[PDB]
Structures are given as C-alpha cells and as structure tokens.
Symmetry: C3
C-alpha cells in the first residue's frame, strides 16, 4: 500500500515492512536477532487506452548486524514492463521465475517456508532470478475466465572469470545457462485452483566441475499444485520433481529430487491465523557415497495475529525431523528446531 | 518532517538530511571530505482506541568515497512497536540503548560529540544496538507529569563462529552477551531535568580472549545527568562510570572508566547558535603497564547558523587535549585537532 | 521527477528509473544482464526572498547479480547548496565536475557514451567527484553561464598521501580547480569552454607504470545545435596526465573527440549516430602513441511517453587488438544493448 503519487496517468506506490524478529535455536548460525526491513516502489504509467507501462523495485535491508558489517542490503526485484490490455504483459529484469507461480501457494507460513527451504533464490527459475523475460497471459485472451499462463526465458548467468563468464558472474550454486519455463493455473471452482509449471535450463561447466555433487547438461523442474482458499480456510500443496536443479546444501546439486509442501490455515474474525505445515525434500543418486538423502524435513506450527492491514505479530515453530548425519554436517544443513517471534509494521 | 502519506489511520513520515561536510586535521584518517546523507521513514498506524502500532527505519549513506568503494551504507535504526496509551510502549529491533536517554543530553554539539567519543555504537546499551526489547513509560502512567522510565533487554550478539556465535556475529568490540538496562528522567520544571540510567550486560568470550585490555564477565554503566533547556539557554552535563564497557581504542576495554561531558549553548533570534563543550574519558587499571590513561580529552567550540527549519551551516572546532603517548599510538586514538565546515539540507 | 511533497515553502521531488537492460558481446566481462535502477530526491526550501536552500541525492542500485553479491549499490550524487536569487549558487558534496558542463553535450547516446568512455567517474573534475565546491552564475552578473569549482585532495588509503576517504590511484586526486563558460550564440546554438587543473598524488606517480607529472589538466571546447527536432553536438578535449590508459595508468597527453547526430520524430522515435575516440600520446614502456577508445555508435530510442521508453544501441568497435589493449584491459569487441525503461 501507500500511493504517494497519482497524477496525469502516472502512479507511484511505496510499500515495505519493518520486521522486528528473533530466532531461538541450538543452531548458532540461525539463533539470535533477525530484524530486517523491506522497501519497494511499484510504478505505473498509462501510455494509451490499450497500453500501460510499469516498473517495480524491492530491496531487502538487514538490521541485525552492526554499522561496520558488510553486504547487509540487496535487491530482490527490479523489472520494467508493458501491459497490452488482455493480450498479456511483458517484463524483463530481476523477477520471480514462473515455477513460483505455483509453489508460492505453500509459501504462506508465519515466518518459515518459501525460498531457502525446498528451493532457493538464484536457483534457475524456481524463485527470484537475474535476467528473466516473462510473458503473461490472463484469462486466455479474455476468453476462459480464471485461466492464466506464462512463458519465460532466462539468459546465461555464468562464472566470475574464465570461459564460462558473463559480466554478472557468481558462484556455481547461483549460476545458470540459457533456460526457459512455463506455468499454467486454473481456478476450477471459486476457492479451488490447480496449477502446473515446467522449467528447463542448461547447466554451466563450473556446476559440472567444481562441486562434487550433481552432474548433467540440463536442469529441469516439474511442478503441480492445488489450493483451496475460501470460507476462512486455506489449504495448499505443492509437489515438484527436479533434475540437477535442487541444492544439496553446500555440496552441490541432487541429480534427482522430490519436494513436497502442504499447509493448512484458518482465519478467525478477531485476527488470529493459526498454521500447520509439512515440508520435505528427498535427494536421490548423490555422488561420493551419499546416495538417497533427506535435504529438508520439518513440521511447522505457528500463528499470526493481524492487528490490522499495517501491523501484525507472530510465532512460528519449526520442528526439525532430519537426522544428523555426515551428509547434513558436510553440506551445512541444519537439523535443529527453531522458534521465531516477530512484530511487523507494514506500509 | 515531510508527511507523504496520511490516510485511513495510517501515516508515513519521510525524513533525512544531506550533509555537505569537510574536516581539516593533521590526522590523515579524519582529514578531508565527509559528505554523507541520512534517509528514513517513521510510520504509525491506529489500531483501536487504546492501541497504536508504529515502526521506524533510518539509513546512513556515505557520499565521500567512490562508486567502486565498499561498505558505504548502513542501517542506524530499524524497529517496530506498539503504544498502549499511558500503560506504556514496547518495541524490538535495532534501537538506542536506554543509557542514551540521559547521555543524549550532551550530544548537541554542532558536529562532534555523541557516538565515537566517550561511548560508541554497538557498544552494549550505550547507543544504537542490535536486538533490544524496550518498554517505555511517560509521565508514570499519566499520574506524575514529567517522570519517564524505561526497561530494556538485549539478547546475546556474539562471535562470527565458534562456541560463542550467533547468526549475526561481529568482532569482539561490538559483541555483547545477554543484558538489561533502565533509565529514569524527571522534569522538575518544564526546562530543568535530571536523569539516571543503569545497564548490565554479560561479556562474551572473545572480549576476554582476543584483545589485550579489559577482563571481566560483566559490563556495567552508571550514568547521571542534568539539563537546563529554556529561555534560549542550553546547559547540560552527564557523568558516567563504566566497568569493562568503555573501549580503550583498538586495544580492548578499560576495566573501569570515568566519562564526563558538559556543554553550554545560546540561541540568538537571528539564527546563530554558539556552543562550547568539554569531554573526557579517563580509563583506570589497564593491563600491560598502562595503568591510568586518558582515552578522550578535548574542548569544543563552534556554532550553527539556522537559515530555517530545513537548512543550516556550521563550524566546529575540536581542541584536542590528549598527550601523544604509547597508549594513544597503540590504541589508534587521535591526538590532533579538527575543524569541521558543513552545509546541511534537511527534510 | 515526482513531487511527493510541497508545503510551507519546502518541496521534495522523488525521481529515478528502472532499466531492464541486456548487453550482447563477445567480451564476456560486458555481455549478459545489466538491469539496474536509480533513485533520488531533489529538495528545495525557501529561506527568504533572495535565498533558497536545496539538496540532492542520487543512488545507483544494480539488480543484475545475486542477493549474496557485494558492492551492488553506490551514491552518484549527494550535495547541499544555496541559491542567491538569480545572482548564482554554491554547493558542496559529491557532484559533477565542471568539465562535464561542456562534455555533457555529447552524453546523449541511447545507452553507451558518457562516463566510462573518453573520461570516467572519480576522474579529477571530468565527471562525478567527491568533495567539490561549486560556484555557478547565470547571465554573468546575459545568457552566459560561468562556474568556478574547487576540490580538496582525495588520496591514498594509508601512508603519506592518505585522507579519510582513501581509494586507489586511478580515482585519487590532489587539490584542484576548474572553470567553465557556456553561451547560447543563436537560439539553438551553444558554445562552451572548460578548464581544470589538479595536483596529482604520490601513488599516481609511483604505483602505475604509465603517466608521470605533478599536475593534471583539461582543456575542453564544445558545440551544440538543438532545435527543429535536430540534435548535433561535438566535444574536443585535450588532457595532460588526466585520461586513463585502462588499468596501466594515465596518458601523459591525450586527445578526445566526441560527436553525435540525432533526430526526434513526432511519433516518439529518436535515431542516433555518434563517433568517439581517445588518442593517447607519449606513453611509457615503449607504448608511444596508442588508441585508448575508438568506435562508431548507432541506435535508437522509442519513447512511449515521458515515463516509458525502449532502445537499442550498437557499439561498432574500431580498436585494433594489440599489446596495449590486452595489457591495459581495453575491450575491442562490439556491443549491442536492448533495454526497456520505466522512469518517474
């Protein structure tokens, strides 16, 4: 919310939040203060009757470290686009890959869930990504109400230097080759929705040489999801099968992985919203003797109290079901439980 | 000021400044361009008759280095809270330690003084800190006009890794253990005020093992202060005794220290505001032969001309009274004088 | 620019852009996604009848790398000032060196051109610079704009030559000054001259192999035609110890020429052609004379309206790949850019 400018067919929306947040956990890399804020601008300009231009920026600013600390802020989203009425829309920038058009349905926990769990950011087209061109079509050309599809292309984001480089190089875990993806979602009834998404990306030579885990020329995802949202009830599930595309912690990628998320929530009238969820990620055919391994496994219980549209408080309890083993230690995968308390101002 | 949004019980205040600033000094680490700007947002949401929610963010952006330089921006404040009428308020985030509810009375110099002098930031509850929970009460529940108090808790902010670590680790000089603090201020008249503050924090293992100077399990501060602010006159003093809490430059902490600051100012009607001040920090029982040492000692003379509420210019002259000795050289403590010239736009 | 506040003689203007931008090139350090945005504030406060105060901040934020990448944002402008009626103005902070009052006339390509090409940022008083005090005057106490500018030393990180805000030798400067003069001879036709003189630093005369001298200097002259939907402009600049010879140092002398032609169609298309070169002279290590920069530029911008545009730009690199270009890390490959831009 927060329209700070609306004049002569041009609109500007300032949005964000300040999330005062603490984690409690035996895992010392997670435990402690997690206060952060987000700030963003959504902009819109009417060009003619049939054509609207738009842009959006969203910035994450950590506030949990010192004034001399490093790397405390980063861009989540930055894209510009055109909306052609009901012929669709096109934008290019740092945006969400289309797979999240479906997996977002289970990304509604009070605090945990979403990117960092069964998938991450800069993880092919599974979450936020550098350099995505995205075509979106609403209601199948104004014909079939509730039917949305999207087509997406991502250019190579390669190594810092050497043969595989681009200008915007990173480490292997956040690299991609050329890739594409597609999503499709349908509101079969009101309240009920189904969705599919697919993605295919080339992998880079660094991804196939530097880490010990994961080999193949191509990274692929296949996703199906369901969602019930009505009568103060929210149910959703997401099942995703991946090839060479799911991080096996710090050790590389899983040659194959199966990811599952399900969540159930109720919204009481006085503002309380309890939540229970289950998330797992099962990795298959890992090298170096790892074989089949749990990448992620937890039950999640929590609640959010909404004071109003601008202020809320919440607790979330991640009940970790992973067994501590040599895979979890070497890959840096947490096996401890975590409680989160937070107080949030939003604008 | 600058209310850019006020609609349906939600308001948003965009504030900050642009400070065109040059230092002149024989100290090469201080001398030269010091231009920087501050930007922030104060937000408030009415929830119900008795309850208001709020948050606040403040960012510091250096502009005195190049476009390829590192670490030029950081968060000063980020916190969210609830105000329950005269039963008090609560907020959590990066915020001011309650000790500063008193020492702030002397932090009114044209340019110098404040953090970096007798205390710093991320320095237990002496200034801005990570992860403080702060309960405040004004006018003692509405029953005693001018009587304010605060109770504050701070979670451990530990090492980058090892046994003593938290998620948001930093170096020993900005670490803290679990700690609390309290403050109390009373307006005897509407210009004259007295105040006290206390804090107690656990020290971390790195604070006792890495630096040469300062040993103890606990950090403690006792602060009393006085203030006269009326009839265009401003007199203020603050006295603070510390234990294992005051930085001995880069060498560690002073086992005990005494800090004194006093300042007098006068506001002319045409907008000129002269200022004289005196500041010192005397460290005691330092290890390695140092014994008693001056940590800070200087006289300050300067003036601010206010063109209006949005624009000012100022000079400030720090006449440094430290002897250049082995302690000051080894601790990285400046012994040179400094002149500052500034032009400031504020919104 | 969007006026988000205007009350009681104080105005606040929020401005910026989101630039969805892709580069294509065989030069792998240039090729790929280049999406970035800029955000700024222009503030103005009325003080009295003869005096206004103001400040401006402009921030660059890259959006083409990951959420764990580092050094992805930096301040381009940050300055506060006073304007004394029409009798001119003064400001201090990070701002444009006065040389750009003239070279800005050729900095109008769809994408390429400007800082990074014949001159750079933090490059004495040629572009954006830390710690500039700038006095400006309209109508020379008529239509004749004058500026005088001083810059304090910005020196090394540590050692003899240090200041608080130390940096590498390529972006250092000593105490310096500059002056500019521009005039509208006819309506549409402008001419301009600019001079700068700065002390070099000890690191600039000791760490890089190229460029020796106590002082850096620039002489610039420029012309501009801007009427009847036509835009022509040129810039000729001579420099001593002031132009960068890539990563190797500075050029003892250099000659930089920039020229551009453009036309603005009513329906919003704006084709552009331009030529840029930088000729370095008297280089150490046997380099002698060398091209530092040489290319033709063709492209176009389509403006949907004042807030949205798309563009293509094609850099036709004419440099020959030789020992100087390789050692100094100067690109000799072509570049194509495609972008879509939202502006507020």
């Amino acid at each position: 919310g927060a329209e700070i400018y609306n004049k002569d067919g041009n609109k500007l929306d300032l949005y964000g939040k300040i999330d005062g947040l603490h984690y409690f956990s035996d895992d010392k890399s997670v435990d402690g203060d997690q206060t952060y804020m987000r700030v963003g601008v959504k902009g819109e300009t009417q060009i003619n009757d049939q054509l609207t231009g738009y842009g959006q920026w969203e910035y994450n600013v950590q506030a949990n470290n010192t004034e001399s600390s490093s790397d405390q802020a980063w861009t989540r989203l930055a894209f510009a686009g055109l909306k052609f009425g009901d012929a669709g829309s096109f934008d290019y920038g740092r945006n969400y890959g289309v797979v999240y058009d479906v997996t977002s349905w289970t990304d509604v926990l009070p605090e945990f869930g979403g990117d960092g769990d069964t998938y991450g950011s800069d993880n092919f087209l599974q979450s936020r990504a550098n350099g995505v061109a995205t075509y979106r079509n609403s209601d199948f050309f104004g014909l079939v109400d509730g039917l949305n599809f999207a087509l997406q292309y991502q250019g190579k984001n390669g190594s810092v230097s050497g043969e595989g480089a681009t200008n915007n190089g990173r480490g292997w875990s956040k690299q991609n080759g050329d890739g594409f993806g597609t999503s499709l979602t349908y509101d079969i009834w009101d309240g009920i929705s189904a969705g599919f998404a697919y993605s295919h990306s080339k992998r880079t030579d660094e991804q196939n040489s530097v880490p010990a885990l994961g080999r193949g020329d191509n990274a692929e995802t296949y996703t199906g999801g369901l969602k019930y949202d009505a009568n103060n009830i929210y149910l959703a599930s997401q099942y995703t099968q991946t090839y060479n595309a799911t991080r096996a912690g710090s050790l590389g990628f899983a040659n194959k992985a199966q990811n599952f998320e399900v969540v159930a929530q109720y919204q009481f009238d006085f503002g309380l919203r309890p939540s229970v969820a289950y998330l797992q990620s099962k990795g298959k055919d890992l090298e170096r003797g790892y074989g089949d391994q749990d990448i992620l496994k937890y039950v999640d219980v929590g609640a959010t109290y909404y004071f109003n549209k601008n202020m809320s408080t919440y607790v979330d309890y991640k009940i970790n079901l992973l067994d501590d083993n040599s895979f979890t230690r070497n890959a840096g995968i947490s096996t401890d439980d975590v409680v989160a308390l937070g107080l949030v101002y939003q604008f």
